[PDB]
Structures are given as C-alpha cells and as structure tokens.
Design a protein around this ligand. Structure first.
Ligand SMILES: CC(=O)N[C@H]1[C@H](O[C@H]2[C@@H](O)[C@@H](CO)O[C@H](O[C@@H]3[C@H](O)[C@@H](O)[C@H](O[C@H]4[C@H](O)[C@@H](O)[C@H](O)O[C@@H]4CO)O[C@@H]3CO)[C@@H]2O)O[C@H](CO)[C@H](O)[C@@H]1O[C@@H]1O[C@H](CO)[C@H](O)[C@H](O[C@]2(C(=O)O)C[C@H](O)[C@@H](NC(C)=O)[C@H]([C@H](O)[C@H](O)CO)O2)[C@H]1O
Ligand SMILES: [Zn+2]
Ligand SMILES: [Zn+2]
Length: 197
C-alpha cells in the first residue's frame, strides 16, 4: 500500500525590533528573519514507517511555512494592523483569510532517497534546522486614536518546515490552511516604538 508521513518542525525564537519615534500617519517597519536553530515537532500525520534503515527508497517533499497575524492588540487595548512591505520570493497564499498571512516556500519535491532517517517524529521531539529563507519585511498601521507614549508589543507567530515523506513518485501534500492557522505560535517579535505628537 502507498504511504505518506508529514511532520511539522516548529522554530521558536524571541527577538526585538526598534521602530523608533513615529506619528500615527507613519508606518514603522520590522523585519522577520528566518533563524536556524532548534525546532520542535508540533504536528504530524503519518501512515508509513517511522524509520528508514537505509535499505529502501522513499520520496521527499519539503515546504517552509510562516503564519503571521494580520492584527495584534496592544496592552492598553488598541489594534495594530500588520501589512506586507517586502515578502521576497515567499508564496503569499490563502489571501482571503481575515486573521493570518500564510507564506510558503516549496523548495524540494519528487526527490528519491535511501538515507537512514526518522520519517515520523512525534510532537515534542527536537532537531537542529539550518535551512535559510528570505526575510519578510512588514509595516504597521497605527490607529489615529492610539494614545501617545512608549509601546512594547509582543507579536507571536509560527515558522518552520513541513517534511513530507512518501513511498511513491509524484507525491504532494500541503498542511491544510485551517491546520496551519492553529499551529502553536512559538516565535515572538517584541515590536518597540514611541507614538509622538
Ligand atoms: C497544492 C498544489 O499542488 N499546488 C498549489 C500551489 O502549491 C505549491 C506552492 O505552495 C509552493 C510554494 O513555494 O510549494 C509547492 O510547490 C513546489 C514548488 O514550488 C513548485 O514550484 C513545484 O512545481 C513543480 C511541480 O511539482 C511539478 O509537478 C511540475 O511538473 O514542475 C513544477 C516545477 O517547475 O511543485 C513543488 C511541490 O512541492 C506547493 O505544491 O499553490 C498555489 C497558489 O499559491 C495553488 O494553491 C496550487 O494549487 C492549485 O491551484 C490551481 C488554481 O489556482 C488549481 O486549483 C489546481 O488544481 C488542478 C485541479 O483542478 O485538480 C490541478 C491540476 O493538476 C491542473 N491540471 C492541469 C494543469 O492539466 C488543474 C487545471 O489547471 C484546471 O484548470 C483546474 O481544474 O488544476 C491546484 O493544484
Ligand atoms: Zn523597503
Ligand atoms: Zn480606535
């Protein structure tokens, strides 16, 4: 029987970004950098062998994901609107979604391999990821009634790699958008800025 194993390796990093002194008519930017580091499995769906011993072939399909909020609330109760300034070569998909951006990069498919490998790692397992992808530059629209002062805003988001191992050539699987939207947001961007007059 034909089999498919899909595992999502989630990256979890905390970082800060200084947007500086801004007036409400301006759009301060922040850069989301793809940082290689320790990834944790947060989702899987498998019906095949959990381990390839090196004696038989399987096929690889890898897709990098960034799932970013379109809006965030300040501690004092105001909305900040997250907009795309520069998404490089990322594929911006499911654009009609009200709450989140979905950025994908499908960089490996139909690749036959024999390499000994863990084909279905379980939620909570960890591994080092060293892959590199484009920065994503965002711009923030401040509401005209935002109170003046210093802001320190936590922006949680998801990033990681979906690895799809299959028994056959031509295998294709994408984590459904409704699932991607609910993957734990393990990264944090602490956005700093001062609303001036
Ligand atoms: C899910 C899917 O398969 N395609 C999505 C597409 O998914 C991509 C995308 O997310 C990228 C992001 O980087 O990653 C993967 O793609 C990888 C590579 O990037 C990509 O370059 C690579 O392309 C290969 C391909 O694998 C080879 O088969 C091909 O021969 O060569 C190229 C390389 O040059 O593939 C990699 C695979 O890992 C993801 O898979 O995302 C987009 C939008 O962002 C869409 O969501 C794609 O899905 C389709 O969209 C169109 C409409 O917009 C249709 O709905 C289409 O459906 C069919 C269908 O109805 O069944 C598929 C049929 O095959 C097609 N029939 C043909 C061409 O005869 C029909 C047809 O066009 C009819 O008009 C519609 O009925 O559409 C969806 O599959
Ligand atoms: Zn620019
Ligand atoms: Zn308001």
């Amino acid at each position: 029987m034909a089999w498919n194993n899909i595992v999502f390796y989630s990256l979890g990093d905390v970082n800060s970004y200084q947007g500086g002194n801004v007036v409400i008519t301006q759009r301060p930017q922040f850069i989301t950098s793809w940082r290689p580091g320790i990834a944790t499995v947060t989702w899987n769906q498998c019906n095949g062998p959990e381990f390839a011993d090196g004696s038989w072939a399987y096929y690889r399909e890898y897709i990098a994901w960034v799932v970013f909020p379109k809006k965030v609330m300040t501690k004092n109760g105001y909305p900040l609107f997250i907009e795309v300034h520069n998404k490089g070569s990322w594929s911006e998909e499911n654009t009609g979604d009200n709450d989140s951006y979905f950025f994908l990069k499908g960089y490996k498919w139909d690749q036959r391999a024999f390499d000994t490998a863990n084909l279905c790692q379980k939620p909570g397992e960890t591994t080092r990821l060293t892959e590199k992808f484009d920065d994503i530059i965002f711009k923030v629209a401040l509401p005209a009634d935002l109170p003046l002062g210093d802001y320190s805003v936590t922006i949680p988001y998801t990033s990681g790699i979906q690895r799809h191992f299959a028994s056959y050539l031509g295998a294709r699987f994408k984590i459904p958008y409704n699932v991607a939207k609910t993957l734990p947001r393990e990264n944090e961007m602490l956005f700093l800025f001062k609303n001036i007059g």
